[PDB]
Amino acid sequence: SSNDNIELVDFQNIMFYGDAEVGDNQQPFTFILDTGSANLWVPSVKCTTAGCLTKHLYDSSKSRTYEKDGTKVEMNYVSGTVSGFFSKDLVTVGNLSLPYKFIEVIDTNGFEPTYTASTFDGILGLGWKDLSIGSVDPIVVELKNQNKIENALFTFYLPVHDKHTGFLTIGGIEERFYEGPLTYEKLNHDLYWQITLDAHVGNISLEKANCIVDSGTSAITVPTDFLNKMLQNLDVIKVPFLPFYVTLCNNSKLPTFEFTSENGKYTLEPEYYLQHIEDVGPGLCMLNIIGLDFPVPTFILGDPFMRKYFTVFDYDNHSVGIALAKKNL
Ligand SMILES: Cc1cccc(C)c1OCC(=O)N[C@@H](Cc1ccccc1)[C@@H](O)C[C@H](CC(C)C)NC(=O)c1ccc(N)cc1
């Protein structure tokens, strides 16, 4: 066995976070563990924007293993931008440490008011090297190269609000987390943890849709066209301007998403994508789904999918393994 287990903390089934440390003195930070990006960044002690106010800040002068870099970086997410410079220091994830190149952030104006209203300190990417700024080798690939872990893979057992905690597990697959078979789907590219699946909901079908398995997206994203076709007559209301689709929690017309390959069929019933339950007035629910268009039809299988399905991210075999997550630990 062995394996490096990092506990995940849930925030109302919307978000979940995990802790890691930087510096030979292991200064603590709370992170978004993101399979959809490939850089680690923590706010520096030299950051004075309002966002930086409530955060755990990184002080390089307090760490002997720190190595100066200074190369300026502007980190642009779809969610916002943070800027700073590269630095090298010891990074500690679970019970493992390694020297690592990260971004020391000094300006978060372009990420406010989001950052100001966040509990996390930084973001820790878990994608492929080519998805990174600075050509940074993935943390997991490094640990493997350094013989600290059994395999160059990590798995996500997402926490379920109310029922249980989760775990980011580095180095090997633990059966304690799933039931039934674990089916692998080959990555179509070494960038995002993206695989090809046929997407189906009700009548609509999108053959060989690119699907990004993203721990960092808190919703299921659907191409707008496909989304337009499925909402016809469903008793699902869109609040204009805003990305909210609301519906009665008991709307019997709600469809099950179906993602299929010749290896497995993964579904997402209404109970997995309806947020709310006993809300404003009667039983209004919002769908944790939004429309989003990429150059080629893409689905982002974000947290709602991962909460149902245990996922394995395998660098050695360039694939994503999917299994039904055990309901409770
Ligand atoms: C939270 C949330 C809710 C609904 C929908 C979405 C999309 C979402 O997520 C918002 C978000 O920005 N998510 C990212 C992680 C994140 C989460 C919260 C706050 C900031 C970032 C990350 O998971 C996903 C994106 C790419 C996909 C949209 C294709 N990454 C980059 O932008 C990126 C940047 C630089 C790179 N070199 C590589 C990638």
* Domain assignments of the chain as residue spans, ordered by start: 1-175, 176-329
Q: How many CB atoms lie within 10 A of CB 214?
A: 24
List, chain by chain if needed, residues with CB within 6 Å of any ligand 1 atom: 32, 34, 36-37, 76-79, 123, 131-133, 212, 214, 216-219, 221, 290, 300
Q: What spacing in Å lies between the alpha carbon of 125 and ligand 1's midpoint?
A: 10
Nearest CA to ligand 1 atom 11: 79
- Burial status of residue 272 (CB atoms within 10 A of its CB: 0-12, 13-18, 19 or more): middle
CA pair distance 89, 20, nearest whole angstrom: 13
Nearest CA to ligand 1 atom 9: 217
CA angle 297, 301, 307 (to 5 degrees): 165
- Burial status of residue 237 (CB atoms within 10 A of its CB: 0-12, 13-18, 19 or more): middle
CA pair distance 208, 163, nearest whole angstrom: 34
Separation in Å, CA 161 to CA 11, 30, 304: 7, 18, 12
Entry resolution in angstroms? Answer: 1.8
Q: What is the 3-state secondary structure (H, E, C) of the chain?
A: CCCEEEEEEEECCCEEEEEEEECCCCEEEEEEEECCCCCEEEEECCCCCCHHHHCCCECHHHCCCCEEEEEEEEEEECCEEEEEEEEEEEEEECCEEEEEEEEEEEECHHHCCCHHHCCCCEEEECCCHHHCCCCCCCHHHHHHHCCCCCCCEEEEECCECCCECEEEEECCCCHHHEEEEEEEEECCCCCCCEEEEEEEECCEEEEEEEEEECCCCCCEEECHHHHHHHHCCCCEEECCCCCCEEEECCCCCCCCEEEECCCCEEEECHHHHEEECCCCCCCEEEECEEECCCCCCEEEECHHHHHHEEEEEECCCCEEEEEEECCCC
Q: For residue 223, what are its two tokens?
A: 């191409």
CA pair distance 145, 151, nearest whole angstrom: 9
Method: X-ray
The CATH code of the domain at 1-175 is: 2.40.70.10
Which of 79, 132, 213, 296 for mutating ligand 1's site (highest number of atoms within 8 Å of CB)? 79
Nearest CA to ligand 1 atom 22: 36
Are both 1-175 and 176-329 of the same fold? Answer: yes
Looking at the domain covering 176-329, what would its CATH class be?
mainly beta
Q: What residues act catalytically?
A: 34, 214
